[model samples]
Target: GSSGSSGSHDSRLTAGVPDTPTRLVFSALGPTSLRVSWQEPRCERPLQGYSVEYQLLNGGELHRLNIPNPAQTSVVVEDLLPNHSYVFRVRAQSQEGWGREREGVITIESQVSGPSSG
Candidate 1:
């Protein structure tokens, strides 16, 4: 008669994976363009790249963009329709793979920038 079997182990490194980016900033570069920027998280392994995902809020195909440089933390999304709501996402890319993501919503309002002659 014998009965005894139990095993428990824990192995995890702090900041092994990238956390959600902080301070996501959005700038309207133009009527149909937007500049998305954010700050990197505390990660032990430096991020190799970043992936940006965006799509229309109403309804549209999702677009994906990859920034091969970790030095660049901002990207400009162009060719978007004005006066429409859009969703954007940013995530860090590590050697392991994609990490946590941060999401942001923005709407570009169409404005009349041309000066009217009197």
Candidate 2:
């Protein structure tokens, strides 16, 4: 005799996060602010959180948003230097730790538009 597929599974329980975040993108909201968005990685457990890690490309001032929630997908980073170049990476947080960090998140320069001549 043999058992049925009632309790069968296609895979085993995940010990940790398996995939990196996808579709990470950002937009300049102003000279000192930016909006970042990304797709959450597929994981077995509810995500503990996500975060935005950014730093000045010409320096080593690392800034991080230690946001934790499974529902949030976007965040606004503030207090950035105008017309400065920075590199940022989004990470998916889990009980163990964060998933893989974004590597190809090329440099982004803040805006430098003068005030309107109204």
Candidate 3:
């Protein structure tokens, strides 16, 4: 006579990571100034820092500024060209690394200050 045996196994695994950008907003301070704001997704661990970058449309030049904290959700960029369109983006930073960037664009228009004589 002979005997035989059977075995079974079970395992569990976590889901994919969740990462997203939220609360993106922008405002024009003036003809030459602009403001941008956004919120980073809350994580179990603290983030290192954040960065915001912007540039004029049809231009190759790019500008970058680091955000100090998550609470500091807004930044005022000055000396922007009047009547010009610009593109901006923001990203989050952590010990692991920087997160994906979110982008937006706006056009700046000049404001009339004095009456025109024709």
Candidate 4:
């Protein structure tokens, strides 16, 4: 005779985010602008949007830029001061929550060029 006794087991723990970050790129577009790009990962749920934040070095000021439903991976931030150092970061938004913010630092050089003499 073969008999089986079964109970309910529903207690389990799940891990958080993965160890690696999604593909993201940041570059200086010009003396007054910077570009950022990132790829959205395939997930069970849909993504909301992105939030970009930046601040000048030596603790000058902080600025926040929101990208609502960004279709492309690239974005250019303009109106920045020239010859200044800054730190920038971006975060992804979704129905579940917001992911960790990715950050980097850059320096914007002056765009003025000297006069050419023949």
> Model 4, 22: alpha-carbon shift in Å?
4.3
Q: What tens digits encode model 1's per-residue C-alpha lDDT throughout 63-110?
A: 999998987999999999878888898889776556788989898976
Clashing residue pairs in candidate 2 (N, C-alpha, C atoms within 3 angstroms): none
Tell me which of candidates 2 and 4 scores higher on lDDT. 2
Error of 4 at 77 (Å): 0.7
Tally clashes: model 2: 0
Residues 32-93 of candidate 3 have per-residue lDDT tens digits of 88898877665444676778888988786789999776567678888788888888887776
Model 4: lDDT of residue 87: 76
Off by over 4 Å in 1: 1-15, 112-118
Candidate lDDT scores, in order, read: 0.83, 0.72, 0.72, 0.66
Candidate 3 residues lying further than 4 Å off, grouped into runs, are 1-18, 112-118
C-alpha lDDT of residue 3 in model 1: 96
The alpha-carbon deviation from the true structure for residue 55 of candidate 3, after best TM-score superposition, in angstroms, is: 0.6
The backbone clash count of each candidate, in order, is 0, 0, 0, 0
lDDT of 2 by residue, 1-118 (tens): 8966665574644467736887667777776778888887877667888878888877779888877676798888778877677777888877655667663243445444657897
lDDT of 4: 0.66
TM-score of each: 0.80, 0.71, 0.71, 0.66
Candidate 4 residues 1-118, lDDT tens each? 8997677864342223212235556566678878877666543456667777778876888988787874554577788888887777766665656666766677786654658889
Model 4 clashing residue pairs (backbone):
none
